[PDB]
Amino acid sequence: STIEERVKKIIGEQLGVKQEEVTNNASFVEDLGADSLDTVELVMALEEEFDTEIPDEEAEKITTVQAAIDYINGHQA
Amino acid sequence: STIEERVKKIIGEQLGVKQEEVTNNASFVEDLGADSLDTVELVMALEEEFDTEIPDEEAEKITTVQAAIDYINGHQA
Amino acid sequence: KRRVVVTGLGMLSPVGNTVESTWKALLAGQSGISLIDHFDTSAYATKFAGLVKDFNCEDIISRKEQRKMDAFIQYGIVAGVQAMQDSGLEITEENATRIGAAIGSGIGGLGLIEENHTSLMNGGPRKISPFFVPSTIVNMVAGHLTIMYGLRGPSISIATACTSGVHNIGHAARIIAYGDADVMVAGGAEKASTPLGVGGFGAARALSTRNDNPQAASRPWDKERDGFVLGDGAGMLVLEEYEHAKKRGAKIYAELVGFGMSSDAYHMTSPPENGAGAALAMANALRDAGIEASQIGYVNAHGTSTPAGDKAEAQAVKTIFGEAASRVLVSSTKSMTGHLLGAAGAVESIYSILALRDQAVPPTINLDNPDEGCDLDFVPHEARQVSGMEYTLCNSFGFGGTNGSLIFKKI
Amino acid sequence: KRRVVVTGLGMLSPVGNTVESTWKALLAGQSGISLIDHFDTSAYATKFAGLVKDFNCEDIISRKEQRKMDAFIQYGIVAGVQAMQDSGLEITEENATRIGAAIGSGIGGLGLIEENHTSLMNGGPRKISPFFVPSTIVNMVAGHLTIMYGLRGPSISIATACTSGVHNIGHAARIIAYGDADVMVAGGAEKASTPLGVGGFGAARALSTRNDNPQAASRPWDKERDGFVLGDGAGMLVLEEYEHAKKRGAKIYAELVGFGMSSDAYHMTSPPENGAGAALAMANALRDAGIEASQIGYVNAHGTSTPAGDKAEAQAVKTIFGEAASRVLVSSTKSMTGHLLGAAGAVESIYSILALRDQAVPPTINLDNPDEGCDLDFVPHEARQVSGMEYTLCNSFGFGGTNGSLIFKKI
Ligand code: NA
Ligand code: NA
C-alpha cells in the first residue's frame, strides 16, 4: 500500500495515535508519547511487518517517523 | 538392548529404584512407591522412549512392570 | 484494636462483569461454563472452562497498554477500578502514603508467556517483547493499580495457588490493623484458560472431562464428579480501617473480623482424609474473630468438585462445627463459576459479604446425588433465604497446600 | 509486644554454597559473575550471569524429585534445609501448628516453563508433564519445605519482583508478632539465568552487555554502568519469637526490629529522580523500629548498577539520613553476586545480619569512578572494619515498583 502508509500505520497502532497525528516530522518520544520500551516494541513491529532485520545500533537512530520511513525504504534492495 | 531391559530401565530411572528392585511382578504404586502422577509421567517416558502413542484408556491398565513390557512388545508391529 | 471493614467491591466472573450481575446470576443458579473456542481444543481432554464473556476494557485500558498486559492483568485492573469507584475514595497527596494493595494470582500470565516463548523458539531472543516480564508476573495488577490511582502505601502480591485470594485479602487486613495503612485494595485475578493452563492442569488429571455437558461438570460433593473446572475472572475489595471509613461517610458492606492460615504438610497425591489443615485454618479464623463456630450462618466452601478434596472438606466442617454442623449452610459457588484458582478466594469473599447484605445464600447446583458422608446442608440446586445471619465464613483449601479462612460480620 | 529474632541461616549464592563461604567471599571482594555455558548465548546481547557453581543436592533431593522441581525450587529447598539445620529447631506434633514459612520468588520456574511449552508446541498437550504446574509456581519452595519438616503453621508466598526477599521476611515477622506463629522460615529463591530470562530482561534493555569483562559489569554508582547483572541463588532465615528462642537455647544472630513498605506509583520507564518511594519505605522501617536514622551503621543498598536507579537511591539515602549521610556506610553486594531478583532481599538480609556479628562491611567492588552526586561512602573496592555498630538496614527498591526495608539490631 506503499511502505510509508504501512510504516505510518505501524507507528499509529503501536503508539495508539490517530493517523492524523503520525506526521513525518513527529518524534516518537517528544510528540507521540512513547517511552523507551515503546520505541523498542515499535522497531520490532517494523521488523515483523517487513521481514527485515534492523541492527540495534541502527534502531537507536530511528527517532522520528521520517527515520523509520527512510530505513525501510533504503533496505528493500 | 531388548525392550524389556529398556522398559525396566525407564521404570528404574522414573521411580528412582535400582534395577534390582524392578522385578517383572513389581507394582508401580504398591512396590515401587509411585503416586498417581508418577505413573502418568512414567507412561509418558515410555511413549517418548519408544516413539509410540499409548491411549490413556490403555495406559490406566499398565499397573505393573510386566504390563509395560507386554504393551511395548505387542505394539511394535 | 484497629478494625477492618469492606467499603468497595469489583468483580469479573464467568456469570457477570459486575458485582451485582454476578450476584444475581449466582442466586439464580446460572452456570457460566461453556466450550472453549479461542484455541483449538481437539487434542485436549478438557474442552470447556468458566470464561469471562463480552469483556471490553477499552474505556479503562487503551489498546496500546493492553498489549503490555496478559488477560489476567486486564481483569484485575478492571475489577480494581470497579472496587475503587464503588468505594468513592478520594485519593489526595495527604492520604496517598496510607493506601496500598494486596493483589495476587496463582498461575499468572500464561497467555503472554506462551506467546513470548513461541517467538523465542521461532526467532531467537530478539523476538521477545520488551514488555514480556511486566506483562506476565503476578504482581503487576497491583503495580498498575497503584500507578493509576497514585497509591504509595504498602503493596504486596501473595501467590499461593488456589488460596491466593483469601491470603491477599487477609494480609491486607493485617497491614491495616498493624497501622501501616488505612485503605487497601485486595483480591486476585486469573486467566488460566490457555493451552498451557488447560493442558497443564489436564496433565495432572485435575480437570473434569465432561465435555458432553460442561454446565454439569462442576458438581461439588456429587457422586459423579471427576475434577474441577477452570474459571477466569477477578475479585477486588477495598478494605479500610473502621474510623477512617466512618469519618468519610463510606458505604460499609461488612467487617472483616477473622483471618486464619495453616499448611497441610502433605502432597496433593496423598490422602487428605479428615482435612486437618482445613480445620486448622477455620479454627484460627474463629479464634482470631473471637466467636464460636455456631455463630457462623453460611460457609462459602472451597468445594472444587474433586473426589477426595470434597469429602475431606465435609469432614473438616464436621470437626469445626460439630453439633452445629447439621444447621450451618455450606455451598460451593464453583458449581456455577468454576475454579478461579488464585482469584477464587477473592470472588468468594465478595459472595460471603453479599450473603450478609441480602440475607440469601447461593446454591451448590448440579448436586444431584451426594456422596456417602456428605450429609451436610449444601444448599443444593436453588438458593436459600436466611434471616438473622451475622457471620459468614469464606474458605480456600489446598488439600496438599496452604489454607485460608476469612470471617465477615454484618455491619 | 512480641519481638522477632533470627535463629537460622541458609544460603546459595554465586560466590558460595553456604552462608559462611558466601560471607567470606563477599568480604574478600570476590566476584561470582561468569559466562553462561548451559545454553547457546550467541544470539543474546548478554552472555553472563551470577551462577550457582558446583550445585549438588542429591543428598537432600533425590533425582526423581528433582525432575518435579525447577532449579529455583531446588535452590530454595537446599537453602531452607541449611537454615532449618542451622536453627537446631526440633519440630514436634505440639509445635508444628506454630511453625510456617514465607518464601517467594520474582519470576519463578522459567526453565521448566520453557521446557513444558516446548513439548507442547512440538507434541500437543499430551506432552506436558503432569508436574508442570507444581514444578514452576513460586509457592512450591514453601510447599516442599513445609512437607519435609511437617510444618502446619501459616505459610504464604510473596512475589513482588525485586522486592520479594524483604517482603517475605518482613511479613514473616508480622505473622510472628501478630501471634499466628512462633517460628517462620522466610526468604526467596531465583534461577532466571535461562533463555527466557536473559532474553526477557535483555529485551527490556535492563541487563548490562559488558560481555568482554563480566566481573566488572556490575558497578553500582560507577559512571560506566550499563544495567544490572542476573544472579541465581536463594536466601533463607529462621525467624522466631524472642522468648520462644530463649527457652530452647537457640542461637540468636540478630533481632528484626523494623519493617517498612511503600509503592512508587510510576512506571520504571519514568524518572525516579529523588526516589521518594525508597525514602518512604526506609522511613516506615525506622518508625516501625522506633530509632533515628543516625543509629544505622550500615545500609545494604539495592544498588543494581542501573544508571537512573543508582542515582535515585543515593538521593533517598540523603533524604533519610540527612546530616548523617556522610557517615553511614552503604554498599551494594550486587557488585559481586549480581541481582538475585526475588531472592536479592533475602541474601542481602543475611549479609546485613552477618555485618552485625563480625562488625565488618562488604564492599562495592568495581566502583572506579563514582557519578556526580554519588558522594556517599559506598565502601569501594575493599571491605570496611567497623566497631560499635548496633543497627543495619537492608533495602530492596523497585524504582517503578514496590519498596521494602528491614532493620536489624545486634543481639
Ligand atoms: Na470459598
Ligand atoms: Na539490599
Numbering used by the authors:
A (entry chain B), B (entry chain B): 1 to 77
C (entry chain A), D (entry chain A): 2 to 412
Question: Paper's wording?
Answer:
In these pathways, β-ketoacyl ACP synthases, alternatively ketosynthases (KSs), catalyze carbon–carbon formation via a precisely choreographed decarboxylative Claisen-like condensation to produce a β-ketoacyl species. Here, we use this well-characterized system to better understand ACP·KS PPIs and KS substrate discrimination by structurally characterizing E. coli elongating KSs, FabB (KASI family KS), and FabF (KASII family KS), as substrate/intermediate complexes with ACP that approximate states formed during catalysis. Specifically, we propose that the elongating KSs employ two conserved active site loops that open and close through a double drawbridge-like gating mechanism in order to regulate substrate processing.
Using this method, we grew crystals of C12AcpP–FabF and C16AcpP–FabF and obtained x-ray crystallographic data sets with 2.35 Å and 2.30 Å resolution, respectively. The crystallographic asymmetric units (ASU) of these complexes were identical and contained one monomer of FabF crosslinked to a single AcpP. Electron density maps calculated using the 2.30 Å C16AcpP–FabF data set demonstrate adequate density for ACP’s Ser36, the PPant moiety, and acyl cargo. The FabF active site cysteine residue (Cys163) forms a covalent bond with the α-carbon of the fatty acid substrate mimetic (1b), and the resulting stereocenter is found in the S configuration. Overlays of the apo-FabF and C16AcpP–FabF structures indicate that the C16-acyl chain of 1b would clash with Phe400 in the closed conformation of loop 1. The open conformation is stabilized by a network of hydrogen-bonding interactions between the backbone amides of Gly399, Phe400, Gly401, and Gly402 and the side chains of Asn404 and Asp265 from loop 2. Interestingly, the backbone amide of Phe400 provides one of the two hydrogen bonds that form the FabF oxyanion hole when loop 1 assumes the closed conformation; therefore, the open conformation is likely catalytically inactive.
